[PDB]
Short mmCIF file of all heavy atoms in Angstrom, two decimals:
data_model
loop_
_atom_site.label_atom_id
_atom_site.label_comp_id
_atom_site.label_asym_id
_atom_site.label_seq_id
_atom_site.Cartn_x
_atom_site.Cartn_y
_atom_site.Cartn_z
N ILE K 28 -1.07 22.51 8.21
CA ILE K 28 -1.95 21.99 7.17
C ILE K 28 -1.72 20.50 6.96
O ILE K 28 -2.55 19.80 6.39
CB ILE K 28 -1.79 22.77 5.84
CG1 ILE K 28 -0.33 22.81 5.37
CG2 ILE K 28 -2.41 24.16 5.95
CD1 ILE K 28 -0.17 23.07 3.88
N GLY K 29 -0.58 20.02 7.42
CA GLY K 29 -0.23 18.63 7.23
C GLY K 29 0.82 18.16 8.20
O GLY K 29 1.59 18.93 8.77
N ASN K 30 0.82 16.84 8.35
CA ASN K 30 1.68 16.14 9.28
C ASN K 30 1.73 14.70 8.80
O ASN K 30 0.70 14.01 8.77
CB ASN K 30 1.09 16.21 10.69
CG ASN K 30 2.12 15.91 11.75
OD1 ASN K 30 3.04 15.09 11.54
ND2 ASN K 30 1.99 16.56 12.90
N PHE K 33 6.60 13.21 5.42
CA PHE K 33 7.15 14.49 4.91
C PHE K 33 7.39 15.53 6.02
O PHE K 33 8.01 16.57 5.77
CB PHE K 33 6.31 15.07 3.74
CG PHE K 33 4.80 15.06 3.97
CD1 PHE K 33 4.20 15.97 4.84
CD2 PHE K 33 3.98 14.18 3.26
CE1 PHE K 33 2.79 15.97 5.03
CE2 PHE K 33 2.58 14.17 3.44
CZ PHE K 33 1.99 15.07 4.32
N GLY K 34 6.91 15.25 7.23
CA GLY K 34 7.12 16.10 8.39
C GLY K 34 5.90 16.94 8.72
O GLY K 34 4.79 16.65 8.23
N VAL K 35 6.07 17.97 9.53
CA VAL K 35 5.02 18.97 9.71
C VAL K 35 5.07 19.94 8.54
O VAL K 35 6.15 20.40 8.16
CB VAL K 35 5.14 19.73 11.04
CG1 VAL K 35 3.92 20.60 11.26
CG2 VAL K 35 5.30 18.75 12.20
N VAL K 36 3.92 20.23 7.95
CA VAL K 36 3.82 21.27 6.95
C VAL K 36 2.87 22.36 7.42
O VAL K 36 1.75 22.07 7.85
CB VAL K 36 3.42 20.74 5.55
CG1 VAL K 36 3.32 21.88 4.55
CG2 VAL K 36 4.42 19.73 5.06
N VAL K 48 2.57 30.86 1.60
CA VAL K 48 3.65 29.90 1.41
C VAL K 48 3.37 28.64 2.21
O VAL K 48 2.56 28.66 3.13
CB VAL K 48 5.01 30.48 1.88
CG1 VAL K 48 5.55 31.44 0.85
CG2 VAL K 48 4.87 31.16 3.25
N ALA K 49 4.03 27.55 1.85
CA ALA K 49 4.06 26.37 2.69
C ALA K 49 5.41 26.34 3.38
O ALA K 49 6.42 26.72 2.79
CB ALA K 49 3.86 25.15 1.87
N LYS K 51 7.75 23.51 5.17
CA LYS K 51 7.99 22.13 5.57
C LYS K 51 9.13 22.08 6.56
O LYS K 51 10.27 22.45 6.24
CB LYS K 51 8.29 21.27 4.35
CG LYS K 51 8.50 19.79 4.64
CD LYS K 51 8.68 19.04 3.32
CE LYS K 51 9.41 17.69 3.50
NZ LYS K 51 9.11 16.73 2.37
N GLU K 63 16.80 16.33 0.27
CA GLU K 63 15.71 17.10 -0.31
C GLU K 63 16.16 18.55 -0.56
O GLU K 63 15.96 19.09 -1.64
CB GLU K 63 14.50 17.06 0.62
CG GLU K 63 13.29 17.85 0.16
CD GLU K 63 12.07 17.58 1.05
OE1 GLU K 63 12.27 17.32 2.26
OE2 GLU K 63 10.92 17.60 0.54
N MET K 67 16.21 20.52 -3.98
CA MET K 67 15.32 21.68 -4.20
C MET K 67 16.09 22.95 -4.60
O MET K 67 15.62 23.71 -5.42
CB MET K 67 14.51 21.99 -2.95
CG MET K 67 13.69 20.83 -2.48
SD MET K 67 12.33 20.65 -3.54
CE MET K 67 11.28 21.73 -2.72
N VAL K 76 6.88 22.97 -7.29
CA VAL K 76 6.84 23.82 -6.14
C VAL K 76 8.26 24.32 -5.84
O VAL K 76 9.19 23.53 -5.61
CB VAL K 76 6.26 23.06 -4.93
CG1 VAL K 76 6.61 23.73 -3.65
CG2 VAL K 76 4.73 22.94 -5.06
N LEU K 93 8.09 27.31 0.83
CA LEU K 93 7.75 26.78 -0.48
C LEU K 93 6.56 27.52 -1.10
O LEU K 93 5.81 28.15 -0.38
CB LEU K 93 7.46 25.28 -0.34
CG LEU K 93 8.62 24.40 0.14
CD1 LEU K 93 8.07 23.20 0.89
CD2 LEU K 93 9.46 23.93 -1.03
N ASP K 94 6.42 27.45 -2.42
CA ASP K 94 5.17 27.84 -3.06
C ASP K 94 4.01 27.18 -2.32
O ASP K 94 4.10 26.01 -1.91
CB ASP K 94 5.10 27.35 -4.50
CG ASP K 94 5.95 28.16 -5.46
OD1 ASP K 94 6.32 29.32 -5.11
OD2 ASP K 94 6.25 27.71 -6.60
N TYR K 95 2.93 27.92 -2.12
CA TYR K 95 1.71 27.32 -1.62
C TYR K 95 0.72 27.20 -2.78
O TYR K 95 0.52 28.15 -3.52
CB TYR K 95 1.13 28.07 -0.42
CG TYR K 95 -0.25 27.57 -0.06
CD1 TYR K 95 -0.41 26.44 0.75
CD2 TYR K 95 -1.38 28.18 -0.58
CE1 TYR K 95 -1.68 25.96 1.05
CE2 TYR K 95 -2.64 27.71 -0.29
CZ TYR K 95 -2.79 26.60 0.52
OH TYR K 95 -4.06 26.14 0.81
N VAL K 96 0.14 26.01 -2.95
CA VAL K 96 -0.85 25.72 -4.00
C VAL K 96 -2.00 24.99 -3.27
O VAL K 96 -1.76 24.01 -2.56
CB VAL K 96 -0.26 24.85 -5.15
CG1 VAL K 96 -1.18 24.80 -6.39
CG2 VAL K 96 1.12 25.37 -5.57
N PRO K 97 -3.23 25.48 -3.40
CA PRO K 97 -4.28 25.10 -2.45
C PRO K 97 -4.91 23.73 -2.70
O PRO K 97 -5.39 23.15 -1.74
CB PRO K 97 -5.32 26.24 -2.60
CG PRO K 97 -5.19 26.67 -4.05
CD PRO K 97 -3.72 26.45 -4.40
N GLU K 98 -4.92 23.22 -3.92
CA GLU K 98 -5.65 21.97 -4.22
C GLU K 98 -4.75 20.81 -4.65
O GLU K 98 -3.56 21.00 -4.89
CB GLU K 98 -6.73 22.21 -5.28
CG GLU K 98 -8.13 22.46 -4.70
CD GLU K 98 -8.62 21.38 -3.71
OE1 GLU K 98 -8.44 20.16 -3.96
OE2 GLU K 98 -9.21 21.76 -2.66
N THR K 99 -5.32 19.61 -4.73
CA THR K 99 -4.55 18.48 -5.22
C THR K 99 -5.36 17.72 -6.23
O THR K 99 -6.59 17.73 -6.18
CB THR K 99 -4.13 17.53 -4.09
OG1 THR K 99 -5.30 16.91 -3.55
CG2 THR K 99 -3.52 18.30 -2.90
N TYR K 101 -5.44 14.56 -6.20
CA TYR K 101 -6.09 13.58 -5.35
C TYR K 101 -7.50 14.05 -4.92
O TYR K 101 -8.47 13.33 -5.11
CB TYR K 101 -5.25 13.32 -4.11
CG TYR K 101 -5.85 12.34 -3.12
CD1 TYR K 101 -5.68 10.97 -3.29
CD2 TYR K 101 -6.55 12.79 -1.97
CE1 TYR K 101 -6.18 10.06 -2.37
CE2 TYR K 101 -7.10 11.87 -1.04
CZ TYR K 101 -6.90 10.50 -1.26
OH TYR K 101 -7.39 9.56 -0.40
N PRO K 145 -1.30 11.18 -7.18
CA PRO K 145 -2.23 12.33 -7.20
C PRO K 145 -2.10 13.29 -6.03
O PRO K 145 -2.26 14.51 -6.23
CB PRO K 145 -3.60 11.65 -7.19
CG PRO K 145 -3.35 10.33 -7.91
CD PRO K 145 -2.02 9.90 -7.37
N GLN K 146 -1.82 12.78 -4.84
CA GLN K 146 -1.58 13.62 -3.68
C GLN K 146 -0.37 14.56 -3.82
O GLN K 146 -0.28 15.55 -3.10
CB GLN K 146 -1.35 12.75 -2.45
CG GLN K 146 -2.61 12.26 -1.78
CD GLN K 146 -2.37 11.05 -0.93
OE1 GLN K 146 -1.82 10.05 -1.40
NE2 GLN K 146 -2.79 11.13 0.34
N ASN K 147 0.57 14.23 -4.71
CA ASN K 147 1.75 15.07 -4.86
C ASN K 147 1.63 15.98 -6.06
O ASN K 147 2.61 16.60 -6.51
CB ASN K 147 3.01 14.22 -4.94
CG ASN K 147 3.37 13.64 -3.60
OD1 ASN K 147 2.97 14.17 -2.56
ND2 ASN K 147 4.14 12.54 -3.61
N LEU K 148 0.41 16.06 -6.60
CA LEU K 148 0.14 16.96 -7.70
C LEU K 148 -0.77 18.09 -7.21
O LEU K 148 -1.98 17.90 -7.03
CB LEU K 148 -0.43 16.20 -8.89
CG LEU K 148 0.26 14.89 -9.29
CD1 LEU K 148 -0.53 14.17 -10.40
CD2 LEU K 148 1.70 15.20 -9.74
N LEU K 149 -0.17 19.25 -6.96
CA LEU K 149 -0.89 20.39 -6.47
C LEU K 149 -1.47 21.19 -7.62
O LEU K 149 -0.90 21.25 -8.70
CB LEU K 149 0.01 21.26 -5.63
CG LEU K 149 0.74 20.54 -4.51
CD1 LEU K 149 1.47 21.56 -3.71
CD2 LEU K 149 -0.22 19.71 -3.64
N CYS K 160 5.00 18.35 -6.03
CA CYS K 160 5.53 18.67 -4.73
C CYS K 160 6.06 17.41 -4.04
O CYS K 160 6.00 16.32 -4.60
CB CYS K 160 4.43 19.28 -3.88
SG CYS K 160 3.15 18.07 -3.45
N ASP K 161 6.56 17.58 -2.83
CA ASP K 161 7.17 16.53 -1.99
C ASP K 161 8.36 15.81 -2.60
O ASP K 161 8.22 14.71 -3.18
CB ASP K 161 6.17 15.48 -1.53
CG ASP K 161 6.63 14.76 -0.26
OD1 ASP K 161 7.84 14.80 0.12
OD2 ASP K 161 5.83 14.13 0.45
N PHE K 162 9.53 16.41 -2.42
CA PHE K 162 10.75 15.85 -2.96
C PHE K 162 11.49 15.03 -1.91
O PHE K 162 12.68 14.77 -2.05
CB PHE K 162 11.58 16.96 -3.60
CG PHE K 162 11.12 17.30 -4.98
CD1 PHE K 162 9.99 18.08 -5.18
CD2 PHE K 162 11.77 16.77 -6.08
CE1 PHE K 162 9.53 18.35 -6.45
CE2 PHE K 162 11.32 17.05 -7.36
CZ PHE K 162 10.21 17.84 -7.55
C1 DFN X 2 -2.82 21.52 -0.25
N1 DFN X 2 -1.45 21.35 0.21
C2 DFN X 2 -0.36 21.91 -0.40
C3 DFN X 2 0.79 21.56 0.29
C4 DFN X 2 2.09 21.98 -0.16
C5 DFN X 2 3.30 21.35 -0.15
C6 DFN X 2 3.71 20.04 0.35
C7 DFN X 2 4.92 19.85 1.05
C8 DFN X 2 5.30 18.58 1.50
C9 DFN X 2 4.49 17.47 1.24
C10 DFN X 2 3.31 17.61 0.52
N2 DFN X 2 2.57 16.49 0.29
C11 DFN X 2 1.31 16.46 -0.45
C12 DFN X 2 0.22 17.01 0.47
O1 DFN X 2 -0.07 16.04 1.49
C13 DFN X 2 -1.04 17.33 -0.33
O2 DFN X 2 -1.61 16.13 -0.85
C14 DFN X 2 2.94 18.90 0.06
C15 DFN X 2 4.26 22.26 -0.83
O3 DFN X 2 5.47 22.03 -1.01
N3 DFN X 2 3.58 23.35 -1.21
C16 DFN X 2 2.29 23.27 -0.86
O4 DFN X 2 1.43 24.12 -1.08
C17 DFN X 2 0.36 20.72 1.37
C18 DFN X 2 1.00 20.04 2.42
C19 DFN X 2 0.24 19.31 3.33
F1 DFN X 2 0.87 18.69 4.33
C20 DFN X 2 -1.15 19.21 3.25
C21 DFN X 2 -1.82 19.88 2.22
C22 DFN X 2 -1.05 20.61 1.30
#
Side-chain angles (χ1 to χ4, degrees):
Chain K
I28 54 158
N30 199 327
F33 46 74
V35 188
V36 180
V48 283
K51 183 175 158 157
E63 179 172 31
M67 303 286 272
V76 161
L93 298 151
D94 283 342
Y95 170 84
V96 193
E98 264 307 317
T99 67
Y101 178 84
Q146 278 159 306
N147 287 337
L148 315 174
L149 307 185
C160 69
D161 203 343
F162 278 78

